[PDB]
Enzyme design. Structure first.
Site, mmCIF file in Angstrom:
data_model
loop_
_atom_site.group_PDB
_atom_site.id
_atom_site.type_symbol
_atom_site.label_atom_id
_atom_site.label_comp_id
_atom_site.label_asym_id
_atom_site.label_seq_id
_atom_site.Cartn_x
_atom_site.Cartn_y
_atom_site.Cartn_z
ATOM 1 N N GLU A 167 34.113 -6.078 14.834
ATOM 2 C CA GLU A 167 33.612 -6.379 16.175
ATOM 3 C C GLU A 167 32.724 -7.613 16.234
ATOM 4 O O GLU A 167 31.588 -7.543 16.698
ATOM 5 C CB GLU A 167 32.847 -5.176 16.728
ATOM 6 C CG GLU A 167 33.628 -3.874 16.661
ATOM 7 C CD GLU A 167 33.094 -2.828 17.611
ATOM 8 O OE1 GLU A 167 32.553 -1.807 17.137
ATOM 9 O OE2 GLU A 167 33.219 -3.025 18.835
ATOM 10 N N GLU A 227 40.036 2.362 13.025
ATOM 11 C CA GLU A 227 39.205 3.484 13.449
ATOM 12 C C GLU A 227 39.943 4.292 14.510
ATOM 13 O O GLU A 227 40.361 3.743 15.527
ATOM 14 C CB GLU A 227 37.857 3.018 14.017
ATOM 15 C CG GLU A 227 37.070 2.030 13.163
ATOM 16 C CD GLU A 227 35.726 1.668 13.765
ATOM 17 O OE1 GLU A 227 35.287 2.360 14.700
ATOM 18 O OE2 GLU A 227 35.104 0.689 13.309
#
Ligand code: NA
Ligand code: NA
Lengths: 989, 989
Positions: free
Chosen positions: B420, B496
């Protein structure tokens, strides 16, 4: 097929749409010479959790009582340890399925034994003035009937049941009934017999009901009198005698009295009168008044009046619905002392004894029927009783009983069908009946905006802007051309406005300006008169008010009971002080040259003859001059110019350039009245000579640099922080910029419109405005003069996870005696979060001091607090208060205690006094931090830590009334901007 | 012009965009025979609140220390009382203004004195394996350099500074630096020296760095080996010796070994090898593997593999970032025991010693660089370092150091640029470098969905539906035709998914079905492996985990650290048990006639030869038969059919019609492995003979009516309530319908899309689903047979201020021994609130019993909990647990402990046992009420009240993974509907 549940028949009664059965026809509350016996006192009381569990041990007979105990009557039994109070507002406390009632329905059995003399034979009646919410009445084991309408009076005939000697009266009271669906007002749910139980003998040839018609011809100055009297529902022959008007007439005939003094809130002239029959005589107070709606104006006795009013619930902090007579007299006198002339009995008829007092001390009273079905709004008014024909008889009974009881009083100038009941057939039935019975009074209802079945257009919490439109008659029309034609021809009244929850209300001035300028606006009623606070004692015996949710309630509205102008013990909140000034009946514009003043009489009837006009000149620590001026009586709605003594104007030019002086012209009572003593202040006006802007001290002192600290003049700094640690010996623990208040109750509420659904308080938390951090940028020393150095601390303020911030720079200077602080504030980046621009609460500085402040003094607006949209009652002068009296004891701790428009301030710390001067700033001093103030749920949560938190704000924000109704007005909002200000500091040791 | 602030120069260092200065070139972590000295142990430690306040007392020399104390190294110093841990997730803990740092920046001075033998002369170096986040290193008062990259290793040259005898090493560590902006991961902010400080001698003619290239030709079965070795950045002559392959080659030359056993997670074959130079020799473990991306598939050694993985943070409940080696070995063995074959080092390189273990026990490892700039997302990635050229060298240094350290290990099958960090130039620079240095491995990054600079398409928390599209290659194209052509040709991986916060995760099966069916899906990684719980001891010495906001943090995310498959002490949450079953490498479909079973081998390389196949037959309280079946080795991705012994099938027809029997075929290890002992369970399959629906008892018993109570069979009722008060002597305090759970962590989170912005937990509270009230309607008695009466209690359920409700009727019957309860449920009105339909959590009954339950037994799915979208690992059988072991110890108490698909249950209360039979129902038993469970913030808040709360649910709701990612799937949601079910009750005293 079989049935096995307990108490079925009891519940069927509770679930009836029928009104009280057995009760005598509704009549007025009259003062009679007929013998009475009050049954108020210690009664026996047994509580049961439900109707299915309610014992049937024949307890009504009064002997072999099991589990009874002494309870005072009248009373609200939760106030006496029997259960606990519960509070909801918009929401019902039970599942909504009319007319069914919950299983958890507290049943209180009431019992008392009294003996009746021969006076109460052969005929007598029992009078209950209020039972919440449903009652069954037995006398000596005989069922008299049931009562429906909790704030309405029921009378039962005990003739042939009442025995000579000892009698036994038993009342079973249920908290919840089908009637709870139509009594959904904003209050604690407190059941019980809360009004007078009375035994009255009914002689033959007596008077059962009296209707008085006292009108006034404002043209001819004649009273128009006609008194109806009846017995058993039929007219009787009776003699009316009015001593003062020297007349004697027979009932039922209409005569015209040649010259009468008319009644009004300004002049409550009443004439003593008695209606005599053979069996008894009735004592009446007659006030001659006439109400007309004409040319879109609400007129009384020929002239348009202005309603300066409040909404009065009936509440006591210790007794429940029981308001002692001395307490009623007290608050009514307090209202008059604060220029209030109107009352709306929200949202039910008050105690019968209230009406008399409203006649005597002048009040325009809006009497509202006991009806509110607000809980059905949740589901789009499905199953609304107002439109259900099953409820028609029950609702008409409520209106009849209401009108019948208080028809004779002059103060009642309007009947009101109820509050927030929606629209329906039954409401139309209620109006239709009332117009037929009593045409003397207009009808009020807010729920139906079409205003089909009423006489006035009424709204609640409409914006200042919207009101301005309505005042000019240019509001948007209705779909129905016919209905719009009617409503556009009606006067307008705000039955509820300027919500007074917490710090506030703000914007009261902008409303009043419209009230004075547009004849169609009748004015209106503030919500509300008092907080519904309830007194509670802690483990260490501190007592403080508690609010909703504090007694374990499954469902509640927190602190919304706390929205009053006075607390539960009738102690004035600052809002009442501001309100008094806004609605003052006289405007006094003092001329600038102090030669005279302009006086306008804002009253509708009276003249300026009951007043004495005083003037005062204050400067420094002395009143320089005082006196009285002679003002020729000024006609209502007229203005004259009065010249002040030459001595006053002479003192104006006489004083030095730049020292402060305050001229105050005050209107006070010439002599005692019923509601106040002579000298009492009614209205005032001022002209102020303000000091010039202070001069920055000579920057002739240099910065002395040590290893860990800096020194300039009397101010010691810290080289790590850039903040002072000591000024003239006073310990400075912290100094920083503040942009955030402890959220008031107005901030916790959503605002009217806007894309932002979030309450302003929430907007701040997401923006991180409550958790600001400072980063030091650099500390410069720059040349001043004669060796003088001007220290400059550059910092940046922001919060975690935020990219926007503010650059603030502190440039210091001193001549060795006086310290000069200058603050520059610049926005760094765009202050937007979550897609919405972030508003600030302030632009100020927080000083944290290591010593306690014993006493605070200042020059500016006081004594009480001042915010941009409030503080109207705060006048110019010199004020000095103990630190404890700076705060304001709101039930839920929030932002309060700011004194705006300050010029100078002095804080005494031990033996040192700290002087602060400069441009107009707002002063706040507290024994505790904001984090403490915000977190606190109650007053006890506030513990002083031994520090002094001093706040100096350059710009402040309006508080508004966003809790309900309009939020902060545009001109009062505070958006991010660059700012500056200079301060003057000095310590006298 | 002048400057007066303290510690300016220190901060300028903290605010540099430069990487660590002075440090030697990045190299791999090698096991060397060169003499080493570990400096781990008691060090001296001084804490300062800021850099401006950080003392300059020449403390680096080690004598006249003021305010130092002994602190273990490596360690995270908040874990040792020095300060406190702090936790945030998406948000930064300080104002975002790169590269500036806050004033509140904890500075920890570290100091240790060690003596150095002659071995470390003339040349040696100091190796720091991790300093968070910025460190300055002095050796004998000489500055060596600084360290940047908290999870990266820095080496400094001490040649000519290190003295013979006693030396003094001083490290100054700052918590926050400019590097904190690029290390914004989901964890506690714990500063300090948390990895090994090591002194190593560098002999002449030694080896500085080794690069191993071990490839496998799956066609020819040949290993392709070539080992680079260098000193001072230049290639050197060295000898490579691999004993087992009997070869001896010179470094730098590429040879082909004829026959090698290839490495994989299933078969971790490693060859011992040593690289020898004159000065030293290096010990290596070589695994031959080749990674290729071909036909949109991620292939290893020629075959498509399936990543069954987790996200592994480095955390300990008592030590901070310090994870002891025995603890690492433990968890890795635990992962293997639960069928896990892949690990993603989130979101930074792990301890150097981790890589070796991942080679030895088979794991596919995704090694992620230490980079996350997630806090800039808040402002639309303004000032994002990933795109700022000022950060280029700093970010490339992070990638280089990461790749260089762990290039030699076979387990690392992918480099990952970080997590991210958005998109930017620097990310492209990082990829470009990595492709140049090491082409042997593909590159992973999730942030840039365009996938311009990577080799695989990677997403997180994509929905099952979306994944199904991607698997078929029919996902919506990119704007760029060229880029879309590339990405559509890439394999897909969820780095994820299935968030495992609280009760959950749900929907794991629907993902796995896609993983098996579509070759393009690589599978993926569960978030996450462990809870970041921290152990805390109360006043009475209870210890429990604490989460964010529990240590006084100004800013926090509450319990989001608690999203693991195991708690901080590596104790399996029920989610891991379910996960083990979902990703099991073998599928066993037992035939219904019990004649045989179908076996498919889901492994990519190995065969079914390491397993032993056992079968079991359970019925009542005895295992009827057991044994072993002989299964010919099954090739990977192939399936055969195995016939069971005739004895088993014979027992099937042999048992009575309608009694339960369970056949279980289990795959267990034939012999011990490195990660488990023989007999350990790998995969299983079942076939169940279920009991027929129970028969309602004969309604031959009549209702006996007394004054306040009813009696039918052994069940005593209350005529006021309609609820039983006693059954067979057991005290029944309450019985009612439930529609609401105590909100899980998934319920507290907003759901993905939809007009309803409200979390499901909030939807319930507004709907009043947690505060239900019942109104009794009537109690009937109806004829059964032979004098028998069937009691019927009709009630309605609802909540305050709500018009909707549910009608439930309880019809009872008994033959005198067994009690038959039937519940009918009908909707009354439309269940909508706030404009949205209200969902239910359950359709069940709550039994409150006056006696404690000592032990719970049942037949169905156990031992652990079962919900519609979970409980995959819950198998059929007979289970009996103490009441204490029924609960699940989630850090924040929430709904858990439900055993779905139950057929019968027995509760022992003192000396009585309560039997419950009927249709499939969900069982839950607790020592406390739901109101207690919901309110509880921690485990200690749960106190038993002496009652037994029994729950029997007809229908349940899915838990989903709404905390982050997909909420409950359609087929698992529970909307209002009419329902029925029959129960069978009995008490054996
Ligand atoms: Na209110
Ligand atoms: Na997380």
């Amino acid at each position: 097929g079989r049935s096995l549940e307990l108490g079925a028949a009891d519940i069927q009664d509770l679930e009836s749409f029928e009104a009280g059965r057995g009760a005598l026809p509704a009549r007025a509350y009259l003062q009679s010479d007929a013998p009475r016996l009050s049954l108020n006192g210690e009664w026996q009381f047994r509580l049961s959790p439900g109707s299915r569990v309610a014992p049937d041990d024949g307890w009504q007979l009064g002997e072999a009582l099991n589990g009874f105990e002494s309870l005072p009557v009248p009373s609200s039994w939760p106030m006496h340890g029997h259960g606990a109070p519960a509070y909801t507002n918009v929401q019902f406390p039970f599942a909504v399925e009319p007319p069914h009632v919950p299983e958890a329905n507290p049943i209180g059995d009431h019992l008392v034994v009294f003996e009746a003399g021969p006076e109460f034979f052969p005929h007598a009646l029992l009078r209950f003035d209020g039972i919440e919410s449903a009652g069954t009445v037995w006398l000596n084991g005989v069922e008299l009937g049931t009562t429906r309408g909790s704030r309405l009076a029921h009378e039962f005939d005990v003739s042939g049941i009442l025995e000579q000697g000892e009698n036994t009266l038993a009342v079973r009271v249920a908290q919840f009934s089908a009637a709870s669906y139509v009594e959904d007002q904003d209050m604690w749910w407190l059941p019980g017999i809360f009004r007078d139980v009375t035994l009255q003998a009914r002689p033959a040839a007596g008077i059962d009901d009296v209707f008085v018609h006292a009108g006034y011809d404002h043209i001819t100055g004649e009273g128009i009198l006609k008194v109806e009297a009846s017995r058993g529902g039929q007219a009787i022959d009776a003699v009316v005698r009015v001593p003062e008007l020297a007349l004697e007439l027979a009932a039922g005939t209409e005569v015209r009295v040649p010259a009468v003094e008319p009644w009004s809130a300004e002049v409550p002239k009443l004439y003593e009168a008695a209606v005599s029959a053979a069996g008894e005589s009735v004592a009446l107070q007659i006030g001659f008044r006439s109400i007309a709606i004409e040319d879109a104006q609400f007129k009384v006795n020929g002239r348009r009046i202005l309603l300066r009013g409040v909404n009065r619930h009936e509440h006591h902090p210790r007794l429940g619905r029981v308001v002692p007579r001395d307490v009623v007299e007290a608050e009514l006198r307090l209202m008059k002392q604060h220029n209030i002339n109107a009352i709306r009995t929200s949202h039910y008829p008050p105690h019968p004894q209230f009406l008399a007092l409203a006649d005597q001390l002048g009040f325009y009273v809006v009497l509202e029927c006991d009806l509110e079905t607000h809980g059905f709004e949740s589901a789009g008014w499905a199953q609304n009783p107002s439109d259900d024909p099953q409820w028609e008889d029950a609702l008409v009974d409520r209106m009849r009983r209401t009108v019948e009881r208080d028809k004779n009083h002059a103060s009642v100038v309007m009947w009101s069908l109820g509050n927030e009941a929606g629209t329906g057939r039954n409401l139309a039935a209620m109006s239709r009946w009332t117009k037929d019975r009593d045409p003397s009074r207009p009808i009020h209802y807010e729920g139906d905006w079409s205003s089909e079945h009423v006489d006035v257009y009424s709204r609640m919490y409409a914006s200042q802007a919207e009101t301005a439109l309505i005042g000019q008659g240019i509001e948007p029309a209705l779909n129905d051309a016919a209905l719009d034609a009617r409503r556009r021809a009606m006067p307008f009244v705000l039955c509820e406005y300027v919500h007074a929850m917490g710090n506030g209300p703000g914007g009261m001035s902008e409303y009043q300006a419209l009230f004075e300028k547009y004849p169609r606006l009748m004015g209106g009623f503030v919500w509300e008169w008092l907080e519904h606070g309830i007194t509670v004692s802690t483990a260490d015996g501190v007592d403080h008010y508690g609010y909703g949710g504090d007694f374990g309630e499954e469902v509640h509205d927190g602190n919304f009971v706390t929205d009053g102008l006075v607390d539960a013990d009738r102690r004035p909140r600052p809002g009442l002080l501001d309100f008094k000034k806004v609605i003052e009946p006289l405007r006094i514009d003092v001329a600038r040259d102090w030669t005279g003043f302009t006086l306008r009489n804002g009253q509708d009837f009276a003249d300026t003859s009951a007043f004495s006009f005083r003037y005062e000149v204050e400067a420094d620590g002395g009143a320089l001059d005082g006196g009285t001026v002679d003002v020729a009586p000024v006609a209502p709605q007229s203005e004259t110019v009065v010249e002040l003594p030459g001595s006053v104007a002479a003192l104006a030019a006489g004083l030095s350039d730049g020292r402060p002086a305050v001229l105050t012209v005050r209107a006070v009572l010439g002599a005692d009245s019923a509601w106040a003593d002579a000298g009492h202040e009614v209205a005032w006006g001022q002209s102020v000579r303000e000091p010039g802007a202070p001069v920055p001290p000579a920057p002739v002192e240099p910065v002395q640099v040590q290893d860990s600290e800096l020194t300039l003049g009397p101010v010691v700094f810290s080289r790590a922080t850039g903040m002072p640690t000591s000024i003239g010996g006073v310990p400075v623990e912290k100094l920083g910029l503040t942009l955030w208040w402890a959220p008031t109750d107005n901030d916790l509420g959503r605002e009217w419109g806007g894309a932002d659904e979030r309450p302003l308080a929430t907007q701040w938390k997401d923006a991180g405005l409550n958790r600001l951090h400072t980063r030091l940028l650099g500390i410069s020393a720059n040349p001043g003069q004669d060796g003088g150095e001007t220290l400059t601390v550059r910092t940046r303020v922001s919060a975690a996870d935020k990219q926007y911030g503010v650059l603030v720079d502190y440039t210091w200077s001193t001549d060795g005696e006086t310290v000069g602080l200058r603050t520059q504030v610049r926005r760094d980046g765009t202050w937007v979060n979550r897609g919405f621009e972030v508003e600030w609460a302030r632009i100020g500085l927080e000083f944290v001091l290591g010593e306690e402040t014993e006493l605070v003094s200042w020059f500016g607006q006081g004594p009480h607090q001042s915010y941009p949209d409030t503080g109207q009652g705060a006048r110019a002068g010199w004020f000095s208060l103990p630190l404890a009296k700076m705060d304001v004891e709101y039930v839920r701790p929030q932002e309060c205690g700011a004194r705006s428009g300050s010029r100078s301030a002095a804080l005494q710390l031990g033996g040192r006094t700290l002087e602060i001067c400069g441009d107009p700033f707002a002063l706040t001093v507290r024994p505790y931090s904001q984090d403490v103030l915000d977190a606190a749920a109650h007053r006890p949560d506030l513990k002083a830590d031994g520090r002094t938190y001093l706040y100096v704000d350059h710009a402040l924000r309006g508080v508004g009334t966003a809790a309900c109704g309009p939020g902060v007005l545009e001109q009062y909002r505070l958006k991010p901007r660059d700012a500056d200000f200079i301060l003057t500091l000095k310590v006298r040791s």
